[PDB]
Design an enzyme around this catalytic site. Structure first.
Site, PDB file in Angstrom:
ATOM      1  N   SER A   1      14.130  -2.846  15.361  1.00  0.00           N
ATOM      2  CA  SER A   1      13.075  -3.854  15.445  1.00  0.00           C
ATOM      3  C   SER A   1      12.387  -3.939  14.093  1.00  0.00           C
ATOM      4  CB  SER A   1      12.060  -3.460  16.517  1.00  0.00           C
ATOM      5  OG  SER A   1      11.139  -4.506  16.776  1.00  0.00           O
ATOM      6  N   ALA A   2      12.188  -5.149  13.595  1.00  0.00           N
ATOM      7  CA  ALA A   2      11.661  -5.287  12.244  1.00  0.00           C
ATOM      8  C   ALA A   2      10.658  -6.411  12.104  1.00  0.00           C
ATOM      9  CB  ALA A   2      12.797  -5.470  11.249  1.00  0.00           C
TER      10      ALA A   2
ATOM     11  N   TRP B   1      -1.617   5.075  11.635  1.00  0.00           N
ATOM     12  CA  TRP B   1      -1.184   5.589  12.934  1.00  0.00           C
ATOM     13  C   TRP B   1      -2.325   5.780  13.937  1.00  0.00           C
ATOM     14  CZ3 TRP B   1       3.184   6.094  15.568  1.00  0.00           C
ATOM     15  CH2 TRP B   1       4.390   5.950  14.867  1.00  0.00           C
TER      16      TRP B   1
ATOM     17  N   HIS C   1       0.828  -1.206   0.000  1.00  0.00           N
ATOM     18  CA  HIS C   1       0.000   0.000   0.000  1.00  0.00           C
ATOM     19  C   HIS C   1       0.863   1.258   0.000  1.00  0.00           C
ATOM     20  CE1 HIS C   1      -3.392   2.667   1.528  1.00  0.00           C
ATOM     21  NE2 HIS C   1      -3.927   2.029   0.504  1.00  0.00           N
TER      22      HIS C   1
ATOM     23  N   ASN D   1       9.169   0.188   5.341  1.00  0.00           N
ATOM     24  CA  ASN D   1      10.438   0.827   5.675  1.00  0.00           C
ATOM     25  C   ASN D   1      11.332   0.980   4.447  1.00  0.00           C
ATOM     26  OD1 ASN D   1       9.986  -0.925   8.656  1.00  0.00           O
ATOM     27  ND2 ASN D   1      10.003   1.309   8.581  1.00  0.00           N
TER      28      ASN D   1
ATOM     29  N   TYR E   1       6.292 -12.723  12.858  1.00  0.00           N
ATOM     30  CA  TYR E   1       5.315 -13.141  13.862  1.00  0.00           C
ATOM     31  C   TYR E   1       4.703 -14.511  13.525  1.00  0.00           C
ATOM     32  CZ  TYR E   1       5.574  -8.687  16.281  1.00  0.00           C
ATOM     33  OH  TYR E   1       6.003  -7.614  17.031  1.00  0.00           O
TER      34      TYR E   1
ATOM     35  N   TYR F   1       9.114  10.328  15.220  1.00  0.00           N
ATOM     36  CA  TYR F   1       9.979  10.521  14.056  1.00  0.00           C
ATOM     37  C   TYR F   1      10.199  11.960  13.555  1.00  0.00           C
ATOM     38  CZ  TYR F   1       9.439   5.455  13.898  1.00  0.00           C
ATOM     39  OH  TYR F   1       9.405   4.117  14.207  1.00  0.00           O
TER      40      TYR F   1
ATOM     41  N   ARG G   1      31.462  12.096   6.451  1.00  0.00           N
ATOM     42  CA  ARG G   1      31.055  10.823   7.024  1.00  0.00           C
ATOM     43  C   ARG G   1      30.231  11.047   8.290  1.00  0.00           C
ATOM     44  NH1 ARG G   1      37.107  10.774   7.621  1.00  0.00           N
ATOM     45  NH2 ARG G   1      37.987   9.913   5.686  1.00  0.00           N
ATOM     46  N   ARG G   2      29.654  12.241   8.417  1.00  0.00           N
ATOM     47  CA  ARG G   2      28.838  12.623   9.566  1.00  0.00           C
ATOM     48  C   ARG G   2      27.407  12.996   9.167  1.00  0.00           C
ATOM     49  NH1 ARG G   2      34.402  14.563  11.768  1.00  0.00           N
ATOM     50  NH2 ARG G   2      33.768  16.634  12.504  1.00  0.00           N
TER      51      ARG G   2
HETATM   52  O1  LIG Z   1       8.492   1.104  11.034  1.00  0.00           O
HETATM   53  C1  LIG Z   1       8.283   0.107  11.726  1.00  0.00           C
HETATM   54  C2  LIG Z   1       7.686   0.242  12.982  1.00  0.00           C
HETATM   55  C3  LIG Z   1       7.450  -0.893  13.762  1.00  0.00           C
HETATM   56  N1  LIG Z   1       7.826  -2.122  13.295  1.00  0.00           N
HETATM   57  C4  LIG Z   1       7.551  -3.333  14.077  1.00  0.00           C
HETATM   58  C5  LIG Z   1       8.739  -4.014  14.741  1.00  0.00           C
HETATM   59  C6  LIG Z   1       8.046  -4.661  15.931  1.00  0.00           C
HETATM   60  O2  LIG Z   1       7.398  -5.852  15.551  1.00  0.00           O
HETATM   61  C7  LIG Z   1       6.964  -3.659  16.283  1.00  0.00           C
HETATM   62  C8  LIG Z   1       7.453  -2.655  17.324  1.00  0.00           C
HETATM   63  O3  LIG Z   1       7.526  -3.399  18.514  1.00  0.00           O
HETATM   64  P1  LIG Z   1       8.734  -3.291  19.558  1.00  0.00           P
HETATM   65  O4  LIG Z   1      10.045  -3.762  18.949  1.00  0.00           O
HETATM   66  O5  LIG Z   1       8.813  -1.847  20.007  1.00  0.00           O
HETATM   67  O6  LIG Z   1       8.395  -4.218  20.695  1.00  0.00           O
HETATM   68  O7  LIG Z   1       6.630  -3.002  15.087  1.00  0.00           O
HETATM   69  C9  LIG Z   1       8.395  -2.257  12.048  1.00  0.00           C
HETATM   70  O8  LIG Z   1       8.693  -3.385  11.662  1.00  0.00           O
HETATM   71  N2  LIG Z   1       8.638  -1.147  11.260  1.00  0.00           N
HETATM   72  O1  LIG Z   2      36.574   4.932  17.034  1.00  0.00           O
HETATM   73  C1  LIG Z   2      36.975   5.390  15.968  1.00  0.00           C
HETATM   74  C2  LIG Z   2      37.165   6.761  15.818  1.00  0.00           C
HETATM   75  C3  LIG Z   2      37.612   7.275  14.608  1.00  0.00           C
HETATM   76  N1  LIG Z   2      37.849   6.412  13.568  1.00  0.00           N
HETATM   77  C4  LIG Z   2      38.346   6.952  12.291  1.00  0.00           C
HETATM   78  C5  LIG Z   2      37.317   6.965  11.178  1.00  0.00           C
HETATM   79  C6  LIG Z   2      37.730   8.204  10.406  1.00  0.00           C
HETATM   80  O2  LIG Z   2      38.737   7.859   9.495  1.00  0.00           O
HETATM   81  C7  LIG Z   2      38.361   9.121  11.443  1.00  0.00           C
HETATM   82  C8  LIG Z   2      37.409  10.206  11.948  1.00  0.00           C
HETATM   83  O3  LIG Z   2      37.117  11.023  10.843  1.00  0.00           O
HETATM   84  P1  LIG Z   2      35.645  11.590  10.512  1.00  0.00           P
HETATM   85  O4  LIG Z   2      34.774  10.474   9.984  1.00  0.00           O
HETATM   86  O5  LIG Z   2      34.967  12.191  11.711  1.00  0.00           O
HETATM   87  O6  LIG Z   2      35.855  12.645   9.467  1.00  0.00           O
HETATM   88  O7  LIG Z   2      38.774   8.286  12.502  1.00  0.00           O
HETATM   89  C9  LIG Z   2      37.672   5.053  13.724  1.00  0.00           C
HETATM   90  O8  LIG Z   2      37.893   4.303  12.795  1.00  0.00           O
HETATM   91  N2  LIG Z   2      37.230   4.533  14.919  1.00  0.00           N
END
Ligand SMILES: O=c1ccn([C@H]2C[C@H](O)[C@@H](COP(=O)(O)O)O2)c(=O)[nH]1
Ligand SMILES: O=c1ccn([C@H]2C[C@H](O)[C@@H](COP(=O)(O)O)O2)c(=O)[nH]1
Lengths: 260, 259
Positions: B165-166, B78, B49, B175, B207, B92, B124-125
């Site tokens: 959780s999936a 929801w 859907h 998802n 399930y 979210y 990478r952030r």
């Molecule tokens: O986007 C989502 C949101 C929820 N769940 C599922 C995972 C779990 O079966 C349940 C959430 O339950 P808990 O893991 O919080 O118990 O909903 C998903 O698969 N995808």
């Molecule tokens: O626990 C750590 C911390 C840092 N790094 C490495 C990954 C990146 O090469 C660099 C941090 O650079 P940025 O991703 O923040 O730019 O340090 C690791 O591998 N493990």
């Protein structure tokens, strides 16, 4: 039996050239995964010697919830010095978030203690999570969190842990990260009355720096030795473990490779 | 390539029996990977859907805590959780659009991410987190698709989702399609092509009351994926449902979520 080396080789052969913050070039892949059965051996690398002291002390330091390098210095560990202030402060990095995530109520959340609780009382929970990625607080940190977020899972009395690490210096960084979380997993399992299961490492940007290529080839030419065994002394709280409570037994690595 | 169906099969065969009210088969730490260049990963082995998927995402982008906007458009996924005023807590989209910083300031993680994609693609952030540890208790329920990272190489935007959780039969199809869609929008707003979508899960479960439905789905031959077309817009927040056309979608019959 060589999840790290397999990953290291894959990125070496298949990585895409990519410029980096540090000005060094990298080869990189995105979204890669390593899996270790902790019951088969402790993944401190044998294809190159890894300094476990740095690893264990840093972890103990994290578990203190400590933002100051002081305690690390008391123990000869200097891996965090470069980033500290003149007071020794780093901002609310890893451990501070682990033990002391500041909640809107003005209170603080101990994610470590919360997880241990869940593991003892509700092991099937799918919410056993520790996060260091505190969006509002990252700017105050000396560095953004790298090993950012981890989850625990329980199956058949065995504890598993999955780490999400957003950036991974495959040659220099990852070997410490693997050892660190493996260690954490043993500590958690022991304190939850469980045995160890899998450690799953999941990376964002997984890169080999261009100035490590030869070192990697060297390491990949080496036959791995059997993994060491991890032993912990008895303690009734994770926060009471000391360096002296940890033993890495039968660690038989190939020689250290120094990096440029 | 059918990563989803493979995963489903794998969990069905090797999953561990467990508890939670219904029981499950469970595996931990499973990963799925889709090359978005090859097609839009809207499942063909059952009618997914998409209307609910697309509207839910647009709702997220709005930063809306209340289900009002979703009823406005006929989406009831929801309902089961809203308050009588129809509020859900800072779920979210609140976290995506306005993560409360200690400073009193709110962080718009979406715009921040888009900005890095435009300004510093090698970063990478580039991360959006919904897992706000302090606010989880206020939420109708805790985030499943907990957070995600972007990555650029050779002009191609990849996305990775971490999902703690999936529900493999009911949740995961959404998802995938949702984050696939979000990656297309980000890519377009950033002037990039689409790369990969990597799905990484924590507790990956079927399930017990879904086994027969799961078997039906698995006996079905997969068909080529549809293609996604996004009408132009100046900003990720201005996309509408009508901007989103899924061309050539030819799924097998829907499979009713059992009671
Ligand atoms: O986007 C989502 C949101 C929820 N769940 C599922 C995972 C779990 O079966 C349940 C959430 O339950 P808990 O893991 O919080 O118990 O909903 C998903 O698969 N995808
Ligand atoms: O626990 C750590 C911390 C840092 N790094 C490495 C990954 C990146 O090469 C660099 C941090 O650079 P940025 O991703 O923040 O730019 O340090 C690791 O591998 N493990």
């Amino acid at each position: 039996m060589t999840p790290y080396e397999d990953l290291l080789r894959f990125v070496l052969e298949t990585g895409t050239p990519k410029s980096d913050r540090t000005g060094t070039g990298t080869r990189s892949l995105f979204g890669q995964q390593m899996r270790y059965d902790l019951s088969a051996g402790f993944p401190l690398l044998t294809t190159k010697k890894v300094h476990f002291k740095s690893v264990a002390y840093e972890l103990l330091w994290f578990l203190r919830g400590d933002s100051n390098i002081g305690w690390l210095h008391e123990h000869g560990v200097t891996i965090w010095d470069e980033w500290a202030s003149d007071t020794g402060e780093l901002g609310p990095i890893y451990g501070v978030q682990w033990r002391s995530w500041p909640a809107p109520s003005g209170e603080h959340i101990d994610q470590i203690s919360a997880a241990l609780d869940l593991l003892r009382t509700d092991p099937d929970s799918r919410r056993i999570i520790v996060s260091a990625w505190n969006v509002g607080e990252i700017e105050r940190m000396a560095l953004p969190p790298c090993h950012a977020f981890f989850q625990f899972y329980v199956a058949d009395g065995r504890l598993s842990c999955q780490l999400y690490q957003r950036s991974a210096d495959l040659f220099l960084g990852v070997p410490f990260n693997i050892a660190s979380y493996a260690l954490l997993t043993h500590m958690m399992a022991a304190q939850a009355g469980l045995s160890v299961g899998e450690f799953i490492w999941t990376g964002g940007d997984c890169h080999i720096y261009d100035n490590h290529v030869e070192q990697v080839r060297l390491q990949l030419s080496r036959e791995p030795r059997p993994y060491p065994k991890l032993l912990l002394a008895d303690r009734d709280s994770i926060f009471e473990y000391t360096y002296e409570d940890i033993v890495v037994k039968n660690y038989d690595p190939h020689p250290a490779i120094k990096a440029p």
